[PDB]
Amino acid sequence: MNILLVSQCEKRALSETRRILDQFAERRGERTWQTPITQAGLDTLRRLLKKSARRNTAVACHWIRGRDHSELLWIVGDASRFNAQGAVPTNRTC
Amino acid sequence: MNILLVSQCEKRALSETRRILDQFAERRGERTWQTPITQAGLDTLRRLLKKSARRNTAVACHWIRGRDHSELLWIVGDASRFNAQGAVPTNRTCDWHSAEDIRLLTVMAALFHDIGKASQAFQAKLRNRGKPMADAYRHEWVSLRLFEAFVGPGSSDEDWLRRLADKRETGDAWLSQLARDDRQSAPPGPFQKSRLPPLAQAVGWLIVSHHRLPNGDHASLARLPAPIQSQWCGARDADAKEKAACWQFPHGLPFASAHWRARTALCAQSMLERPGLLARGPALLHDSYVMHVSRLILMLADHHYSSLPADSRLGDPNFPLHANTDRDSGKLKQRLDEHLLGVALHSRKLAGTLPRLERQLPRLARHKGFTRRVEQPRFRWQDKAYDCAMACREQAMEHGFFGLNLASTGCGKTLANGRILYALADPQRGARFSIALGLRSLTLQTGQAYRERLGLGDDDLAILVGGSAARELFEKQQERLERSGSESAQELLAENSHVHFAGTLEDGPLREWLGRNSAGNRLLQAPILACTIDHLMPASESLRGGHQIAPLLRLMTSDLVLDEVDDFDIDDLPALSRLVHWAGLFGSRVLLSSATLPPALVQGLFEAYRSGREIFQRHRGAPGRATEIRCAWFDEFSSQSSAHGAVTSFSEAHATFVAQRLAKLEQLPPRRQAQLCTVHAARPALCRELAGQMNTWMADLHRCHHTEHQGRRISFGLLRLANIEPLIELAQAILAQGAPEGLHVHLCVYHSRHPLLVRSAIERQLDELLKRSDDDAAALFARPTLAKALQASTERDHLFVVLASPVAEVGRDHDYDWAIVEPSSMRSIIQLAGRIRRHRSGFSGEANLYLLSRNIRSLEGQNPAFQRPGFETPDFPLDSHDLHDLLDPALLARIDASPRIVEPFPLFPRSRLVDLEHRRLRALMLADDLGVPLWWQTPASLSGALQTSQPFRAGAKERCYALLPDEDDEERLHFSRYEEGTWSNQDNLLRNLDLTYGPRIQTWGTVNYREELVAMAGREDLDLRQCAMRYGEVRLRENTQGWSYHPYLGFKKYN
Amino acid sequence: KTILHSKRANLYYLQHCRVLVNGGRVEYVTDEGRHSHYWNIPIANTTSLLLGTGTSITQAAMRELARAGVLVGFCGGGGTPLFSANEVDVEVSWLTPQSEYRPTEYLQRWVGFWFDEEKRLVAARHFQRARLERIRHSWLEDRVLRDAGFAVDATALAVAVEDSARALEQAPNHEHLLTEEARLSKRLFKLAAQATRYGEFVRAKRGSGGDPANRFLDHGNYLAYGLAATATWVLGIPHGLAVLHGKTRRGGLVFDVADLIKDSLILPQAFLSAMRGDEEQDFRQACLDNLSRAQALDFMIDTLKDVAQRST
Amino acid sequence: ILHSKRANLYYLQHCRVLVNGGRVEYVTDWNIPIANTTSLLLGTGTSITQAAMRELARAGVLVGFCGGGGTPLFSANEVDVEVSWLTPQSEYRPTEYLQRWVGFWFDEEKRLVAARHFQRARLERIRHSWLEDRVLRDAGFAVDATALAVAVEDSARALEQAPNHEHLLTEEARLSKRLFKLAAQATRYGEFVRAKRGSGGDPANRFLDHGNYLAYGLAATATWVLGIPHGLAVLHGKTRRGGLVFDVADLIKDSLILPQAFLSAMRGDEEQDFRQACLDNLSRAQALDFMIDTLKDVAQRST
User: Fold this and answer.
1) How many CB pairs under 8 A join A and C?
2) Which of B544, B603, B543 is nearest to B573 (CA)?
3) Which cofactor does it need (chain D)?
């Protein structure tokens, strides 16, 4: 499968998310990875991310089920940074 | 589809990328979007991104083809931020071998270029707000004379440099050493003998030719620039007072100014510091590359700075002299020191900018329509040509390229040329090439056809519509421009000419000098350009003006395709040879695309390209490379490639390929059969007789060849005539004669004298109705325009006839059933044969092409009969004008490119038409029994003598006219005339023409001028009158009586 | 922790780069004239590397590569072998990890049965029987290839495969087996050229072809070799213990294992990419997709296991 | 540089191997016999290029990337087989030791004979290093001489008979257990019990584990040089991963690693200093050459 990993981590969590995800995927943007992967490898990556996860960790993995239909597979860490479909806000204010 | 947009934009580009992408997609990360989309929406998004794209823009779009396989669709902007697969780096950390010499020469010539404006006469003329008085001497000439004075006669190339490099020097006594052409005894030219050291001579030529080329008179050419005299550059017959006035300097030359002298000293010291610079003097002086690149930079910098507003941040604030006055008010604008310093600063900036042009300019990459393989066995040579070009890519990049696309007509040569020149490009960067059609004027329809055939939008391919214009305003506008003191303020390209481009024009590398929406900026920013060869000729054939800048920059920053290159008249061949030589001179790669290229023309063009490429290799690239031009041959049957360093091996390889192609051409089945027709020997009678015969002839041809469906027989035919006025007369004769017998006839008149939009409408209809295929009767009879015409009448037989000028041989992909053709030249016969049944297969064996025994120009008794178009001249006469003797009877059985590609032996140049053509071509191009090779053998490029001895498009002096609607009333139309940036009113010269209609004959494939004008004005979102003045020109020779105009017949000359 | 070596998806072909360790990460550097770009390599998801022309590697990078079981091979650019030792050519110089300790059962079975010529020809026949079956499967009984434009003449493929199997059953020795394999490969090339309306295809050797099909086949051979080397190393069997291609090729077990998927997945994809106007990167990604979707590495592992088990 | 001249291997450190003019040159920021028996072992701070690999490939030069000083051996080129069945056409020199190793390996009797030969060599090394050479003792490793001799004699008298692999393993375990206590008494470190699985925090345990790692790397290098795979063990069980590496490393494990570890624990040196001392000692005794010679002798003396 082709998966798309998007990170919203901050402070100390970003360093560890980069360290873990740079070994499993290729970068596409500043905080975006993408790689072909298998189900077993995907589970290994998810468990690795969940083991060393702080309060600032926020990693989302997307998937392409059907053309023109993306599907959020899971979110590791703070799930409030993404909406139901996995998008990100353009601005957050108190 | 699901797409993933990733942005690497920075600074101002990021804001616009966010603004555009937030409307088409949802955010996923900080710089990542993703949305479902359709193909049309994806194209809309890509074009929106490409329209407003700066240098920092970088947007990549991914796509999911197959599970676990993403595919990069395209990259908009800087493609270096992503790798091939579209990834991004995790961290980024920090060949011109004569650029410095060119920069120094350009800067020094810029500093000394307008030093002659200090003259009292010039200052008075600038201040003379009254009646203008023409200056006796051109300011370039007195600038050169002042340079001679400063340098001193006989002085060494180091003495003057060191003297100028000494800032503590105010010895104006050098002015006493000056000469004066106004004074008697005829002082020697500054270039003869040792009046100038070999380097100051180069700078003096740059100074004297920063507004026009030193075209003079008269071994003399080989001795250039020595034979330059005062009479060569301008000069006018004036009284002694005026002549003397140009030499007295009351306020002193700009040598007292501290900044000017400091910059001059800095430049001189930099030149002296350069190792070996003062040694290449004679080499640099005669080097076409160095001189012409330096002159382009100098002239562009001067053109840019002559339009800038006054600046008080440089130059002496209270300098007494001036350089120009604003045309809006006439008040003095720029001080001479400020002008010279600005021209030098911009010259240095442009010299620095030029090496970056190979990476800063937009290119076309990742195109799939050029790499996709074909599925039909017919178009399977387009893949052999692509493979051959890819096999050569590296060697072509290293050494050069001279390709020859000799495929027969109807095989789809445009896509082949595109694929070849795309294969020759580096896949990582992309391709940039020009398509120079061999036509006098390019209509919008031909450009749209090029876009469709290559499968490119208007974001990748630009169209330079219209045709080139000879100097007409050279007398009126030049007066105002010289009065204002800025003679380099005329636009780099013509005024009516428009570039139809909708791509990246925001942050182009040369935006500062060219402009932003200016027609030079669009001409340069377009990855692929569709122009005419007449548009690129001003690169090498510009004598007076800056018309040579934009074509030259396009030549340096693109490849070259010469479509229908043999269509040029024989007298215009040397200009094309010069253009090819300069294309090879500035590193371009030329691909000739014609099906009827004779060996002599090909040999001459190859020699020109090789000569240019040698000098280019001497200045750009790894030194020591051998001049081995990577020649390639392409055809409908195969593709070869080899390296050749001399015209001796290239000729043998070309002969081998031609022999193989002829052998494969013989075995082809026949699809065209030609029959000679003998006509019975003024206009109103000869045309009537011809119209009488072309009833029985058309009836016979329709009976022989036609299409049958539901008991109704339709046949499409073509009648080609050499000239237009006889064509219009014969059109009238046919129209007021009616159908021959029960055979309903639809006639279409199509020549080059119609309004350009009208001509494009006729071409649009003829290119949509004349597309045929095997067993297409069911679709043919269902076409709307055909349907109405067939259903309206009750006759079962219809004859759709096209009456066309020689303009229908180039760019027209039409499939006729039969043709009646007057004889002009063998190339015309071959091209018109290649159009009857060009899409269909299966021949009935009956004759379908009819050739008249003699042309109209022979029936009238004129001699030579084969002229305009043609090859017959008084120097090369023909013993007969009947086709029964000039043609081999064996040729009528099968007509193809064979008689033209190969050279018959022995040559009978006064009894065979093709023999005459080959004899003339080998006499002019090569030598045989003012030669073309003198353009590169002798330093004739330093003067405009060759361009005047062998002019281009000489003879007739056409004038631009249009049917401009009245400003107050749109319904009323006025026959106008472009005189000088102003459309005058000439209703007295135009009259209506009455047409009589015979039994059962209407007109098809016509257009109403008003409806087409309003439709195209709405399409282009332009003012109706502006649209009329921009795309409705008609070029007619000046006639005192006037013309008679009919919408269906164009403008016919009236007497 | 890294993914199981048989569950890894990526494969890297590198050129004109410098593979090194930058801040604890294995990355390769490309010179962009005025800048150097560092690109990360997902070692925990990459089966093997292929270093083409103008590549170089350091000891630290190679140490971090041989710690997740990532093989490294020095191929040649443009589908060209590393060099040509007179009449034979070697394409990849494999650097198998040695600090990782591999299973020790399949290796014993292989060394036990490998030194008997009859028992090693039995293995070659069993290897070809799986190649034929997978060719049949992929070309006919799978829809993904057909939906992408591959329309093979079912009857012609069936008769070709049947004739190849009949020739295999009566194979006297290795030479006839090689001749039958070559005949089947040539007939499959012709059938694939016809199926994708590619025109007339003539196979060129030693990377001398110019048409896209030849170049793509020469490139995909490297991906097949990489997967085969990964599988053989994972099972612990040395590359040198070949069963069919040991007469002329060093490390012939890699070629023998790669032959299982070379004609069944690389071949259709080469022509499909040629017809689509693909560059080498797009063809490489398409081939990797085909191999991952069809589980080619798992098939190689299972076939090696079955041959070893049946050897006893 | 010549780590093991008996096998023609070379160790390059802190140099870039590249090709200029068609000849490989190690441009350090050397004259090497480039031939079928060169076998370079690149080390710390070394980078190789593709052209260098090609020219080392058309010379039969096997290339391996080892750690700092020689161990561990990260990855190496694969040695081919010289069996008459295959016909490897190259400039390489295929080995013929795998054939003999396979020919004797499957029979349990010859496997046991080879294992007993291994144990004999191990004990001989213990007695040579601990008693015959006093360099270690003079360095501060005074031993109980007679006690070590008695223990070695008991171990030999136990290994010389009692067939069955488990009996030999138990004898080796008993010998190691007695030897550890003897070494502790010799160095006066006091009471010490080895912590299995490398969980000890005492300097002795961690130093012993580091020595185990170094010896395993050296054994991997030796087996790669000879060409024997790691699976075909002689002492360990057939199901133990990398059994042959452990068996080969055990020859130099207790003889050199244990005394150096105890001395470094006494001196309180850092891990890097202890590793350097271990590497220096292993270089002194030609450990790699000894393991290569022992494997060759074991293979030849069973045909």
Assistant:
1) 50
2) B603
3) Mn(2+); Mg(2+)
- Helix, strand, or coil (residue B522): helix
Q: D185 vs A46, D129, D132, D180, D281, CA distance in Å?
A: 51, 17, 19, 9, 22
Q: Do A90 and B22 touch (CB under 8 A)?
A: yes
| A90/B64 Cβ within 8 A | no
Residues of A in contact with B21 (CB under 8 A): none
Q: CB–CB of A88 and B28 under 8 A? A: yes
Cα–Cα dist B794/B777, whole Å: 19
| Residue B132: cis peptide before it, omega within 30 degrees of 0 | no
SS (H, E, C) B267-332: HHHHHHHCCCHHHCHHHHHCCHHHHHHHHHHHHHHHHHHCCCCCCCCCCCCCCCCCCEECCCCCCE
Chain A CB within 8 Å of residue C147 CB: no
Instruction: Name residue D73's beta-bridge partners.
Output: D66
For B225, the token pair is 């620039």
Mapping DSSP onto H, E and C, the string for chain A reads CEEEEEECCCHHHHHHHHHHHCCCCEECCCCEEEEECCHHHHHHHHHHHHHCCCCCCEEEEEEECCCCCEEEEEEEECHHHCCCCCCCCCCCCC
Instruction: State this model's resolution in angstroms.
Output: 3.5
- Sign for the pseudo-dihedral over CA of C132, C138, C139, C141: positive
Q: Does C215 touch chain D (CB under 8 A)?
A: no
- Three-state SS string over chain C comes to CCCCHHHCCEEEEECCCEEEEECCEEEEEEECCCCEEEEECCHHHEEEEEECCCCEEEHHHHHHHCCCCCEEECCECCCECCEEECCEEECCCEEEECCCCCCCCHHHHHHHHHCCHHHHHHHHHHHHHHHHHHHHHHHHCCHHHHHCCCCCCHHHHHHHHHHHHHHHHCCCCHHHHHHHHHHHHHHHHHHHHHHCCCCCCCCCCCCCCCCHHHHHHHHHHHHHHHHHHHHHHHHCCCCCCCCCCCCCCCCHHHHHHHHHHHHHHHHHHHHHHHHCCCCHHHHHHHHHHHHHHHCHHHHHHHHHHHHHHHHC
Method in brief: cryo-EM
The chain C residue lying nearest A48, using CA atoms, is C1
Taking the CB of residue B1024, how many other CB atoms lie within 10 A of it?
16
Nearest Cα of chain C lies from the Cα of D232 at a distance, in angstroms, of 7
Decide the pairing of beta strands B559-563 and B590-593.
parallel
Peptide bond into B906 cis (omega under 30): yes
Please name the member of D54, D85, D233 whose beta carbon is closest to the beta carbon of C82: D54
> Residue B66 and residue C9: Cβ atoms within 8 Å?
no
Which of C40, C274, C289 lies at the smallest CB-CB distance from B90? Answer: C40
For B900-918, the DSSP string reads HHS--SS--TTT-HHHHHH
C15 touching chain A per CB within 8 A: no
CA–CA dist B992, C97 (Å, integer): 93
Q: Which of B22, B27, B88 is the closest to A28 by Cβ?
A: B88
Q: Which two tokens stand for residue B158?
A: 């180091």
B 24-43 residues with CB < 8 A to A: 26-32, 34, 36-37
Candidates A6, A22, A27; nearest CB to B28: A6
Interface of C with D in 132-171 (CB under 8 A): none
Distance of CA B516 to the CA centre of its chain: 21
CB B605 within 8 A of CB B591: no
User: Nearest Cβ partner of C99 from D54, D94, D220?
Assistant: D220
Say how many CA atoms lie within 13 Å of A20 toward its Cβ: 25
Chain C contact set for A61 (CB, 8 A)? none
Residue type for B345, please? L
For strands B559-563 and B433-437, give the pairing. parallel
